[model samples]
Target: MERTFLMIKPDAVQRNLIGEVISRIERKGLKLVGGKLMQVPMELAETHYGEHQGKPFYNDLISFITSAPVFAMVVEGEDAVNVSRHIIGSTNPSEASPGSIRGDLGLTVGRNIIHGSDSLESAEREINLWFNENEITSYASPRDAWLYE
Candidate 1:
């Protein structure tokens, strides 16, 4: 099975969308192997967003991520990375399609409700960074047969 890292950002958590967001992911049939709601420390935030460190918005990114609590998750399924991306929608809410998470609830790019790993390599890196090995557990959903054929 493919796996991906997905996060419900602080804005979404403060807005009380965790259950709604998670429900959407689960309804799409992705298996959630690990999840936690916790505040992000600046060090980890910088590390998680290291690729964007030199950009103008780097500080803003770090600040916003650490401003509140976020829900981090490890999801598993066939094509999990791409599938989760589809569920998250575009990074810019204005450009996202109507049925996607951002398009449906987000107001701006900076406060976009969710984050999903962009590639398999990043997924592995992120999952390791955010969750301990024991924290990521595996399980089967009875409806998996219908969801994945």
Candidate 2:
């Protein structure tokens, strides 16, 4: 199974949408292997967003991400990376199609509520960054057969 990282951002946590967000993934039939609620440290935030360091919003990005507690998760399933993107919807709330997480609930890019790895490589890197090997567990699900083609 492919794996991806999905983070419920600080804004969503503060707004109490964690259950709604997790439910979206569960309803899609993805396997949730790891999850936690934690406050992000500055060091980890910087590293997590290292690629955007030189950009204009770099500092603000780090500041906001570390502002409060966030929900980090590891999901496994067919095309997990892309599947998460569909669940997360467009980064710009206005551009996201209806029924998606962002489309249904978000109102701004800065407070878009969630983050998903964009590709397989990024997924692996993100999963590693947020969770240790032991933190993630694998198992069979009764609905797996029905969820997959």
Candidate 3:
């Protein structure tokens, strides 16, 4: 199975969309291997977006991410990395297509509703950053097993 990380940003959390967001992923047949609600520290935020360092908006990005509690999760399924991004939509709200989490709920780049890892490497790094090795749980879903190989 492929795995990817998805974070419900502070704006989404404050707006009470956590359940709605989780339901979408769950309904997509992805496994929630790990998840939590936590406030991101500034340092952690910086580290998380280190790739954007030296570029414009780096500081603001970190500051915005740590502004409030965020819902972070590890989702696993086939082709999860790209599929998760499809669920997240584009970074810019205007460009976010209809039906996506960002397209429907996000109104600004600074307050985009969610953050999904862009690639497999980033997914692994993000999962490790937000969850402990032991926090992830695994099990067979009877419904899935009954429906597919």
Candidate 4:
């Protein structure tokens, strides 16, 4: 079992891709264990994107992320980190595969619509940082028997 964190950006929310985005992840057989709509605070944003703090786009990223409500989700599955990355696609819209979330829904790099943890390491950290233990839940899905062996 594995878990990953996924955040639907302001642009995607604005574009009304919430259903479509989650639909794809669900169809791909990953389990949605937690999700919520919340506005990212500056403190969390700063820490979340700390790796990019010194970059020129850092300030803009902080501004954009905190500007609107984002849909944060915790997805679980086998190799969930990699599974989520494939569904999310490339960071650059044009470079992503046609069927991916970014490829179909996004435009420029900055507005590329969604964020999925790039590695298992980050997934653990991100999930913890974004969600409280009580916020996440585990439950049975009728298809689980067929989805996993």
TM-score of each: 0.98, 0.97, 0.93, 0.98
- TM-score of decoy 4: 0.98
**Candidate 1: worst-modelled 10 consecutive residues by lDDT:** 140-149
Residue ranges of candidate 1 with Cα displaced over 4 Å: none
Quote the positional error of residue 110 for candidate 2 in Å. 1.1
Residues 1-149, candidate 1: write the lDDT tens digits: 89999999999999999999999999998999999999999889999999997899888999999999999999999999999999889999999998899999999999999999999999999999999989999888899889866
Model 1 TM? 0.98
User: What does each candidate score in C-alpha RMSD?
Assistant: 0.7, 0.8, 1.4, 0.7
Residue-level lDDT tens digits of model 4 in 1-149: 79999999998888888999999999999999999999999999999999997999999999999989999999999898999899889999999999999999888999999999999899999999999989999998999899888
- The residue ranges of model 3 lying beyond 4 angstroms of the native Cα positions read 146-149
Go through the candidates in order and give each one's C-alpha lDDT.
0.94, 0.93, 0.87, 0.94
TM-score, cand. 3: 0.93
- Write out the backbone clash pairs for model 3: none
Cα error of candidate 3 at position 46, Å: 0.9
Over the stretch 27-139, how does candidate 2's per-residue lDDT look in tens digits? 99889999999999999899889999899989889989999999999999999899889988999998998899999989998889999999899999999999999999999
| lDDT comparison, 2 vs 3, better candidate | 2
lDDT of 3 by residue, 1-149 (tens): 78899999999898999999898888777888889899999878988999999988888888888889998899988888998888878999879999988899999988888999999999999989888879888877866675356
